Symmetry: C2
Subunit: 321 residues, 2 copies
């Protein structure tokens, strides 16, 4: 399915277009080992140490209405993280962008989820343990748009818990600031949230400050100001965008430690991520956040984020199909 239901008045509306049924790449495109191939066919060698050791970094960029959003920023973030991992990219920035945009083209999707993965790769002999012998492998795929939170929740908000049983991985153990596939703590959080009947969980770090959720940054709105955790959390591109919008409106937006107490005391809570953008979190721990309905500042920031996808700018590049 290349589209799914969204609220009628909503700022979020899918684009009307019919997939060609002739092209194999239509509706799913991936690029593996120097070849573009249909997503249904994409496979990687079990012996890639990025699977065996999750020795990888990734980024995802979203395309809405034919436009890729902040793709240059995402690739810059991917390469900064790889350098921290002493992981070396086979391709340069431009080359990676080139592959990504072609992928969306052959995918033929106005709305799509695009993943770029850089892994330590494999050497000649299976299971090799030497960094010297491995050569990094890049994997890129474009698939129908994916929602961290359902679109109806994007308009009307979502429910969350602070998980008691799991905490976010520390900066010195598995750095959350490098986007990674090592989701053990995050998956644990989601299981705890659904046992508690919430849709998600906001995790805390070792000192007890707010960290992030599974797949999203958390932004806390109080006294007409925005705060988001500065440590034990990814530097999300969606978060940077939300802060940019807030500064344009003249609202104070800061990255700092955020106490759990603040989380409970907040006027508005939002979850921000590349897949689905800006989500109101209307309830925390079974209790209403403020009114119980999406906060006005959250509403403003979300509505302008979706607007940004359509207005022409440096941030959005038009995919050519």
């Amino acid at each position: 399915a290349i589209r799914e239901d969204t609220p009628p008045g909503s700022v979020i509306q899918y684009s009307d277009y019919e997939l060609d049924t002739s092209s194999p790449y239509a509706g799913g495109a991936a690029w593996i080992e120097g070849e573009y191939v249909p997503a249904s066919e994409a496979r990687i060698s079990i012996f890639d140490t990025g699977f065996g050791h999750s020795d990888l970094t990734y980024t995802v960029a979203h395309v809405w209405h034919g436009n890729i959003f902040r793709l240059a920023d995402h690739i810059e973030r991917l390469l900064d993280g790889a350098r921290k991992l002493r992981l070396a990219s086979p391709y340069d920035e431009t080359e990676i962008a080139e592959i990504a945009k072609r992928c969306v083209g052959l995918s033929q999707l106005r709305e799509a989820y695009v993943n770029i993965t850089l892994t330590r790769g494999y050497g000649k002999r299976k299971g090799e343990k030497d960094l010297s012998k491995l050569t990094s492998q890049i994997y890129v795929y474009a698939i129908p748009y994916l929602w961290a939170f359902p679109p109806y929740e994007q308009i009307f908000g979502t429910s969350a818990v602070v998980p008691r049983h799991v905490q976010r991985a520390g900066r010195n153990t598995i750095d959350p600031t490098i986007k990674n596939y090592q989701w053990g703590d995050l998956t644990a959080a989601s299981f705890e949230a659904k046992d508690r009947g919430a849709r998600t969980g906001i995790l805390l770090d070792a000192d007890g400050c707010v960290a992030e959720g599974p797949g999203f940054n958390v932004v806390v709105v109080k006294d007409g100001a925005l705060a988001s955790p500065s440590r034990n959390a990814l530097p999300g591109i969606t978060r940077k965008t939300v802060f940019e919008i807030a500064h344009a409106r003249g609202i104070s937006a800061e990255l700092r430690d955020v106490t759990s107490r603040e989380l409970y005391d907040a006027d508005e809570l939002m979850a921000v991520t590349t897949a689905g953008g800006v989500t109101p979190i209307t309830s925390l721990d079974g209790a209403a956040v403020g009114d119980g309905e999406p906060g006005p500042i959250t509403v403003a920031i979300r509505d302008r984020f979706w607007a940004l996808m359509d207005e022409p700018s440096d941030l959005i590049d038009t995919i050519r199909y």
Copy 2:
């Protein structure tokens, strides 16, 4: 591939000499994926398996020496116990998994081999579905030429380690070390730090400052003729289990407990235990000799008897039928 490698001449570690029959494609590497056996060089999985995207998986590794696979049932029991902890459900049963693992070793034709069984959350027909129930779990098994966490000459003569200043092992409440996982971020950072310091490995610490499993290996500390190994934040190693059993048969006292870092420095002998290569002395820590700087008596005894264990008939060993 190379079925063998050089081993020290006096050493208890000697490869079995045979030659691979080059006719078969499976010879030298066998794998089982999506319901069919395939040559290892051909083994691949869908990018969309959530075992990659989220590393939502558990695994175990068994070693084959001189034609016999070692404690394979214990390994499969541990894998599925962890899977139950992860709310991960296996498609195939205990017997079925053992059946596939041993067939992989047979078609491999390796009398010395590395066998991996991996259980993953898998992939829904929809690409990247977040719904747990919509996904269907996958079992992947592969048998490949033997791999050494430490080189055999290092098994006989010892190895070097540091405790990293910059990295800690993931805690029980973040990514459970007690479940075998591919989430090696902390472990990889540790190996990098040891290389920069010029040691071959690193012994990690937990949040309280107690010893934690070194990457790909449990740590055993010998002091005053007794064995201690970390009880919290270390995988329950089968090699460690065996090392403890041998210690009991020899009348050496062995306990699973918290080990303070100072204890690590104060030790008489240090050993590293894992399935891939067994028992390794750690002669030097942080660039200083551990005692004599030579493999410890207790360590040597348990190492030699471990390898001997591979050859004596027992319930621990099952003979692989390479006929196929």
